[PDB]
Amino acid sequence: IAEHPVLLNRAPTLHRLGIQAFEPMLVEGKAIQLHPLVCEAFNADFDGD
Amino acid sequence: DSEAVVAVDAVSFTLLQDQLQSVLDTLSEREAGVVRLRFGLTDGQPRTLDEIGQVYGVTRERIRQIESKTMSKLRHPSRSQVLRDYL
Amino acid sequence: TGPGNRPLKSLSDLLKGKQGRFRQNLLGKRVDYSGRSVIVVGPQLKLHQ
Amino acid sequence: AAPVTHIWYFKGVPSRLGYLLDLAPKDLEKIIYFAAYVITSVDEEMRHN
Amino acid sequence: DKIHARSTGPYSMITQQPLGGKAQFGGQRFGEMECWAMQAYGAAYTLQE
Amino acid sequence: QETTRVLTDAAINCRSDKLNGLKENVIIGKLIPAGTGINRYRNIAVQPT
DNA sequence: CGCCCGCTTCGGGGCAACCCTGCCAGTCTAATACAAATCCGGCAATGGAGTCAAGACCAGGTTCG
DNA sequence: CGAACCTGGTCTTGACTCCATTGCCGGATTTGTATTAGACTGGCAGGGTTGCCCCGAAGCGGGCG
Ligand SMILES: [Mg+2]
């Protein structure tokens, strides 16, 4: 996995910053852990998105 | 679509062809030639023992001896260990 | 109509509408090497992670 | 075993067959579904004699 | 119930696209708005892939 | 829009597409002519000095 | 004297977010008669393909005077 | 120093076996066609129910020649 980015999309992709690439790192459990600053860029809250 | 390509069987079959070509290249020229012409590796149409002896100048029975020897040789685990896992 | 009073999907109806080949299968396609999960916040990650 | 008019060049608005022959679309649907005849040709010399 | 991933699974019948939904494997719909985001980055190669 | 009506008068006029827009190259699988698909960047030679 | 240019009314087609998540729709004269097609099930034309068993032989390490 | 030995491949002969493979061959089934002689003589049928917009078409009032 190391140094191999992945594209993250939150549907719908309203504008250009709705797709953003991130270097992954493995995290236990089953949820995509997301940085707290890009939530405005995706317009993503955490109520089940 | 079950009729479509499984797309790992293709790379598996190509790797199987490569491993089988390596294992056949462990044999000699007469042995690998007899095996490839017996199973039709070169054309898809496997010629039989009389045609193989005709292209090898010998009897069909000599070819049967050679084919028995090569099937004895291939059944050794020294060749079988990297082919058993392909089924 | 077809059985059950269903209108038969003719040749033009494969291009018309959102169900046509253009907007359903030519522009937007389903992609392999994809994935989907519900997100959680990751306040120990760095911004590129 | 007998010719057929394309529905795209007849029924769409404006009717392209209708403009190409300067026929009204009511006349065109009256012709191409065998509801009314059309005088496809005429004579002049035998006509006046 | 919600997590999902597919590297290579089934494919559709008429067009040869991957399928959809967690019941099959399926891939995520890379729809039109994702395509506009990838164009707006200028990333042509990734859109081609 | 109007996939019927746009198509037929293009077919009447025998209008030839030029494959130089942006929605065209997305459809036919070529690289888009914007961002990393223009020939200012797509023909870069890289040699090690 | 009779005859057609702009409102005007009416038809009439196109389109109205993006992911998931599903998963299978029907009935009324009824029969014979036949000819051909075609399947199909089984001996017999093989005939060729495979198989066993013996053997011919060189010669090459291996055993002996 | 020279003579045999047993045994590897290498190949040959010839007989034996066994099974494809047509070829009939007779029968079974199955696919298509013809034929019914009292008299019968014009259909059932709901999706339509938006909103808005653009536009084509009819239609009439209006001045008009
Ligand atoms: Mg939310």
Side-chain angles (χ1 to χ4, degrees), chain A, chain B residues 1-2 4-80 82-87, chain C, chain D, chain E, chain F:
Chain A
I1 263 174
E3 270 108 355
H4 181 101
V6 283
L7 306 162
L8 253 79
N9 190 207
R10 175 213 198 263
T13 313
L14 276 89
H15 66 149
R16 182 189 98 154
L17 266 66
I19 285 186
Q20 271 176 23
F22 295 89
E23 166 203 337
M25 41 181 281
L26 277 187
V27 157
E28 292 269 9
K30 280 175 192 170
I32 301 164
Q33 289 216 348
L34 191 63
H35 206 261
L37 285 157
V38 311
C39 314
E40 190 171 348
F42 291 133
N43 194 38
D45 44 357
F46 298 90
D47 46 356
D49 287 14
Chain B
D1 181 21
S2 96
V5 193
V6 190
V8 86
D9 56 337
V11 55
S12 173
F13 183 79
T14 303
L15 260 305
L16 162 76
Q17 278 210 349
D18 259 352
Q19 201 63 74
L20 201 271
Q21 263 323 106
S22 67
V23 165
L24 251 52
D25 282 326
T26 64
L27 285 187
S28 99
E29 276 297 324
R30 293 183 71 199
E31 306 158 346
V34 154
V35 162
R36 279 154 204 162
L37 295 183
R38 182 54 176 168
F39 281 106
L41 291 205
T42 174
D43 63 335
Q45 180 220 17
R47 306 153 197 81
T48 79
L49 307 180
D50 194 76
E51 306 94 313
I52 288 161
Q54 206 51 56
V55 88
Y56 257 56
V58 299
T59 89
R60 49 164 210 174
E61 201 34 73
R62 171 62 187 147
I63 290 301
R64 187 182 82 91
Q65 294 160 349
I66 290 164
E67 199 254 13
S68 174
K69 215 62 64 64
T70 50
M71 286 319 269
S72 175
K73 275 181 156 186
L74 258 304
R75 266 160 165 84
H76 209 276
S78 69
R79 273 81 163 251
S80 161
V82 274
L83 296 182
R84 179 54 233 147
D85 307 333
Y86 268 106
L87 296 184
Chain C
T1 84
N5 220 326
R6 193 187 97 264
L8 297 187
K9 181 181 256 72
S10 72
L11 278 178
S12 317
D13 297 359
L14 305 153
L15 307 112
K16 261 183 290 184
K18 214 178 306 189
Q19 303 316 293
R21 282 277 187 275
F22 279 137
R23 324 168 59 205
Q24 185 113 34
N25 300 140
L26 260 308
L27 301 150
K29 304 180 175 166
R30 313 292 213 116
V31 287
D32 275 356
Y33 311 103
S34 144
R36 147 155 298 203
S37 154
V38 43
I39 54 172
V40 296
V41 70
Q44 78 263 16
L45 302 179
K46 314 296 187 29
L47 190 46
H48 59 260
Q49 285 155 345
Chain D
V4 148
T5 86
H6 205 315
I7 209 193
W8 265 7
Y9 307 105
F10 150 74
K11 196 58 179 175
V13 39
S15 65
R16 274 97 175 174
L17 268 156
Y19 281 177
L20 198 269
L21 310 174
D22 210 358
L23 263 305
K26 236 141 200 161
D27 300 335
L28 221 51
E29 195 142 352
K30 274 187 153 50
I31 290 174
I32 70 172
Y33 295 91
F34 307 99
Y37 293 91
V38 62
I39 311 297
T40 165
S41 165
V42 83
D43 288 345
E44 338 292 329
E45 41 271 34
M46 301 178 176
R47 161 189 208 83
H48 87 297
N49 292 140
Chain E
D1 296 332
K2 290 312 164 195
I3 212 180
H4 202 36
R6 163 212 180 123
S7 92
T8 293
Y11 286 103
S12 155
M13 203 42 110
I14 315 180
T15 170
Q16 284 309 289
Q17 304 216 355
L19 232 45
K22 205 218 182 314
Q24 306 93 234
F25 269 167
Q28 264 47 246
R29 174 124 188 91
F30 193 81
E32 222 167 343
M33 315 172 83
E34 291 87 351
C35 275
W36 305 330
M38 295 304 295
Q39 292 142 10
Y41 278 113
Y45 267 115
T46 314
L47 184 55
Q48 185 202 18
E49 308 271 304
Chain F
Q1 264 196 6
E2 42 249 44
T3 317
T4 295
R5 151 80 167 83
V6 167
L7 197 64
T8 162
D9 54 350
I12 290 149
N13 304 11
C14 215
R15 220 163 59 208
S16 146
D17 187 14
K18 293 306 290 161
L19 288 174
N20 280 355
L22 201 271
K23 257 174 170 174
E24 280 82 11
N25 287 284
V26 166
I27 284 174
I28 66 163
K30 269 189 54 193
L31 279 83
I32 89 172
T36 46
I38 63 174
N39 300 334
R40 293 194 80 258
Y41 308 134
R42 220 194 39 214
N43 305 332
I44 278 182
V46 180
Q47 27 200 353
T49 73

